[PDB]
Amino acid sequence: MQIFVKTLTGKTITLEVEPSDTIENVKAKIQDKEGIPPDQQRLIFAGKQLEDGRTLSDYNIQKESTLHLVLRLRG
């Protein structure tokens, strides 16, 4: 299936995923297209902070839904 990822700038990215893809898998898919390492990736769905070890289905994240990508910086 396909889901969308929307960045702070409003850009819309499209990923191909399966319901059992983990949030870590999603971050890797985003890295392939955006070049942002998973360390600097925070993903939000319906206001909830998604965690790496869970799957899209664990959050009931269904086809053609939108995730929100945000930078997390450390130093």
């Binding site: 960045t7 702070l8 700038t9 070049g35 942002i36 390492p37 600097q40 925070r42 939000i44 206001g47 909830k48 902070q49 965690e51 790496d52 070890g53 869970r54 929100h68 945000v70 930078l71 997390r72 910086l73 450390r74 130093g75």
Partner: protein, 144 residues
């Protein structure tokens, strides 16, 4: 859920795991404060001088003492979030800043090697810009 588990294991934490956004409501600029945390009187983690470059930058832009900024974090975050095990090695995060913004009414545009992110409160009393490079925070005028 590594974030939830690390908070549930924290002995300095109380209550259910929730986003800081919800634990301390305020005029957040989306998505400021959208990170999982738990409620705590005050942490005893001493001021991490060698790794407080984030607090130095905020201090320089606002005039708030660095140790005033730290005390605020120690009084509002559980030990697991103040020190995930890499406090001395990797320092502080934009989540720590989201807490300072809520307490002191700050807004900061972070300019990073991998894009920008704007965090803080809407009608903030202090507005500045901080630049991020791999492992470093530095106050700037308004880069890029």
């Amino acid at each position: 859920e590594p974030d939830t588990a690390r908070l549930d294991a924290d002995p300095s934490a109380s209550g259910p795991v929730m986003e800081f956004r919800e634990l301390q409501k305020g005029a957040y600029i989306e998505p400021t404060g959208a990170f999982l945390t738990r409620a705590r009187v005050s942490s005893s983690i001493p001021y991490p001088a060698r790794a407080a470059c984030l607090l130095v930058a905020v201090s320089q832009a606002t005039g708030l003492p660095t140790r005033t900024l730290w005390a605020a974090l120690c009084a509002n975050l559980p030990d697991s979030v103040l020190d995930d095990g890499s406090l001395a090695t990797l320092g502080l995060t934009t989540d720590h800043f989201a807490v300072l913004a809520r307490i002191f009414s700050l807004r900061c545009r972070f300019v990073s090697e991998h894009g920008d992110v704007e965090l803080g409160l809407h009608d903030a009393t202090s507005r500045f810009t901080i630049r991020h490079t791999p492992g470093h925070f530095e106050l700037v005028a308004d880069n890029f």
